[PDB]
């Protein structure tokens, strides 16, 4: 709705094409993460400042930890909860802080460690999976009462499979993919491992339907596989699908991302000097199709939102946040019920008549809702609203 009424030509573009807005953050941004729906943008600033902008205004709506317990130094991970209520974050202050966004003055729960953090990830229940700096094992923190448990070089990035939330994937600092089966609470045996490179894996992304996977090596290449699982979470194989790279100047990659469900597009951000653009390839054929060309600085992070269908990325030198969104132009054709606009001179055919001058009971359902829009995004999902705080409004 606002899309059903729109014409299905300028609304069904496959990816953003131009940048529209450029948020300026007073601190320096380090992590971006939309809400489960395209409602809120949870930014992690330079010095542990954590803001939540709103996409309807681009101006802040809530700064968690304003009372106490806030973060003090660069944040490294921001993971939302599928409903929208809870929000997990982790910084270089070794602490993992889960916030209930119904009382955002103070952290709801938090745990502390003995090393900086790379990333935290949600599971439901309430249990997160974390990767610690320089360590060689992940951590399962099922902190409804704050317990912590543990589970080829090191472990850098972790990610849970989308279709089978018992499967867990992890990449090593030496080239090994290692898979885990969360068949228990705090005892997990591997189900598969392998070594595809000689360099550090830096990112592990997976499509929403477990039918694809991508990997960013420290070598200037991107390895894209077509994973598949079966056999009560035992059958697991990988088939090399493609390898992407920069043929001209062999630049390195900073972050990668897929499309929504079938992952028909792969978006990557380059890292070297003179690198200001985002590449967008297909995945079936693997040929380059687009280059986002908006910013003027090395771009670190990427995030895609499929409801509003926007790409968001934070600069490195400045600290701003640029947004490339699909743009729909206003059609004068709407101003009347029969105003059809054309592009070229149409010819006119006339019947012999034109020169010669001179109950209902249709099905109506008002209480039924629509499940999917034109793009294919699932409505009716619970969209928790951050409560407005009035105390900071009177001044």
């Amino acid at each position: 709705m606002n899309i059903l009424l729109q014409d299905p030509f300028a609304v069904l573009k496959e990816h953003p094409e131009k940048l529209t807005h450029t948020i300026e953050n007073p601190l320096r941004t380090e992590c971006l993460q939309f809400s489960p729906c395209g409602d809120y943008l949870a930014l992690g600033c330079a010095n542990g400042a954590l803001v939540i902008y709103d996409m309807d205004t681009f101006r802040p709506i809530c700064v968690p930890g304003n009372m106490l317990g806030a973060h003090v130094r660069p944040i490294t991970s921001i993971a939302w909860s599928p409903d929208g209520r809870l929000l997990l974050t982790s910084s270089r202050d070794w602490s993992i802080k889960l916030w209930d966004l119904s009382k955002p003055s103070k952290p709801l729960k938090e745990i502390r460690f003995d090393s900086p953090i790379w990333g935290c990830q949600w599971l439901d229940r309430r249990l997160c999976v974390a990767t610690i700096f320089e360590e060689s094992d992940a951590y399962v923190i099922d902190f409804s009462n704050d317990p912590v448990a543990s589970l080829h070089g090191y472990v850098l990035v972790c990610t849970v499979h989308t279709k089978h939330p018992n499967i867990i994937i992890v990449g090593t600092s030496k080239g090994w993919l290692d898979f885990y089966k969360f068949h228990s609470l705090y005892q997990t045996e591997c189900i598969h491992s392998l070594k595809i490179t000689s360099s550090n894996i830096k990112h592990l992304i997976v499509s929403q339907n477990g039918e694809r996977l991508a990997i960013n090596c420290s070598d200037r290449t991107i390895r894209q596989y077509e994973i598949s699982i079966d056999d009560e979470n035992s059958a697991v194989e990988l088939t090399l699908e493609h390898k992407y790279q920069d043929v001209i100047n062999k630049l390195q990659w900073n972050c990668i991302l897929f499309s929504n469900n079938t992952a028909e597009y792969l978006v990557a951000s380059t890292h070297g000097s003179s690198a200001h653009e985002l590449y967008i390839w297909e995945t079936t054929s693997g040929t380059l199709v687009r280059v986002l060309e908006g910013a003027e600085e090395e771009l670190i992070d990427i995030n895609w939102d499929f409801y509003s269908m926007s790409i968001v990325s934070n600069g490195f030198e400045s600290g701003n946040v640029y947004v490339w969104s699909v743009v729909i132009p206003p059609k004068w054709s709407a101003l009347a019920p029969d105003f059809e606009e054309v592009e070229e001179n149409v010819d006119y055919l006339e019947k012999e008549d034109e020169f010669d001058e001179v109950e209902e009971e249709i099905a109506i359902d008002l209480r039924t809702r629509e499940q999917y829009d034109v793009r294919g995004n699932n409505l009716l999902v619970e969209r928790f609203t951050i409560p407005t705080d009035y105390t900071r409004i009177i001044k």
Binding site: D7, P8, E282, S285, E343, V374
Partner: protein, 75 residues
């Protein structure tokens, strides 16, 4: 009966069909009129993508209706 297929490029084609024809028959008709293989196209009506297996009459399409043909473009 006539239905319309509006292509992005500005062209509208006036296909002749029967309500008992399947959508697959409609894609075949768009091909045999314009030569576009049914696999490469994508048909849209009233905000809902017409599903591959079902029939024209499933969507209550009657004569002189218009509907939008977008291409699943590639390299």
């Amino acid at each position: 009966m006539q239905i319309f297929v509006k292509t992005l490029t500005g062209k509208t084609i006036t296909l002749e069909v029967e309500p008992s024809d399947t959508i697959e028959n409609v894609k075949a008709k768009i091909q045999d009129k314009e030569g576009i293989p049914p696999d490469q196209q994508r048909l849209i009506f009233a905000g809902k993508q017409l599903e591959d297996g079902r029939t024209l009459s499933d969507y209550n399409i009657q004569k002189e209706s218009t509907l939008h043909l977008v291409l699943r473009l590639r390299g």
